[PDB]
């Protein structure tokens, strides 16, 4: 659920900072061009906000958890 969620942002090489609030998944990338809008939304996202250089994936309560699942897909 999270290994394909890191690819939806481009990949460990494009995600500069992985973060998440209560219901969103505010992740800051290096290149928005590489952000997969479909895959994110076809994985649970109710909307993808691309304000500037930071994406905000709308998944819900699973967000606070998903940010953790994606950080483990490095180690």
Partner 1 sequence: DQIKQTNAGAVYRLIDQLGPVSRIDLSRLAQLAPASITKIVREMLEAHLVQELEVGLVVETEAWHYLSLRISRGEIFLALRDLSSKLVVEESQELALKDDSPLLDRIISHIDQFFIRHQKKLERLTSIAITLPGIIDTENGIVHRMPFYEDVKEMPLGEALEQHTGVPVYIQHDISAWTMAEALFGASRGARDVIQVVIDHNVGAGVITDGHLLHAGSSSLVEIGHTQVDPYGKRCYCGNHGCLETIASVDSILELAQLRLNQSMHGQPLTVDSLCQAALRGDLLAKDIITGVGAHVGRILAIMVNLFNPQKILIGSPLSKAADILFPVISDSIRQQALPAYSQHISVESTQFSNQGTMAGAALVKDAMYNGSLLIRLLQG
- CB of 23 vs partner 1, minimal distance in Å: 3
Q: Is 60 in the site for partner 1 (CB under 8 A)?
A: yes
Residue 65 binding partner 1, by CB under 8 A: no
Based on the shown chain and the rule CB under 8 A, indicate whether residue 24 belongs to the binding site for partner 1.
Answer: yes
CA distance 53 to 74: 22
Considering the rule CB under 8 A, would residue 14 count as an interface residue with partner 1? no
DSSP track, 3-61: TTTTGGGT-TTTEEE----SS--EEEES-GGG--HHHHHTTT-S-EEEETTEEEE---T
Binding interface with partner 1 (CB under 8 A)? 17, 21-24, 26, 28, 46-54, 56, 58-60
């Amino acid at each position: 659920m999270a290994p394909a969620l890191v690819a939806a942002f481009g990949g460990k090489e494009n995600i500069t900072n992985l973060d998440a609030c209560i219901t969103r998944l505010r992740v800051s990338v290096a290149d928005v061009s590489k952000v997969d809008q479909a895959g994110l939304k076809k994985l649970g996202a109710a909307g993808v906000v691309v304000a500037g250089s930071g994406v905000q994936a709308i998944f819900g309560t699973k967000s606070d958890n998903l940010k953790t699942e994606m950080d483990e897909y490095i180690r």
